[PDB]
């Protein structure tokens, strides 16, 4: 903090205290058991119909069309982008 009322790092100067975050902030961390269970279920369950349509588009190297279709089905650009990368990984695993 620069000790001024305006600027980039404005604010009263104080001694910062470093501590490990709250345990509640550790949410979203993939445990080893959770990843193990989800792999077992993934083999049993399979793929949703819209996922299979995207993988066909990805195999034909229509990446823009695959993202557009993934966006319309999922709803948001961020979730579609994350899903397409996830689908691009499962394609790679299937073909060694």
């Amino acid at each position: 903090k620069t000790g001024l009322a305006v600027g980039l790092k404005k604010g009263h100067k104080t001694t910062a205290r470093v501590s490990k975050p709250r345990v509640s902030r550790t949410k979203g961390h993939l445990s080893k058991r959770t990843a193990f269970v989800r792999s077992i279920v993934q083999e049993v369950a399979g793929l949703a119909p819209y996922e299979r349509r995207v993988i066909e588009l990805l195999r034909n190297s229509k990446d823009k069309r695959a993202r557009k279709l993934a966006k319309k089905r999922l709803g948001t650009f961020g979730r579609a982008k994350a899903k397409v990368e996830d689908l691009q990984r499962v394609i790679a695993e299937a073909r060694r």
């Binding site: 269970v37 989800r38 077992i40 279920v41 049993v44 369950a45 399979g46 949703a48 119909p49 819209y50």
Partner: peptide, 17 residues
């Protein structure tokens, strides 16, 4: 019960459908 909860999210899969 953890396994089936994960399965129940796959409501578009062939088994669940």
């Amino acid at each position: 019960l953890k396994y089936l909860e994960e399965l129940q999210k796959k409501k578009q899969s062939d088994v669940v459908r």
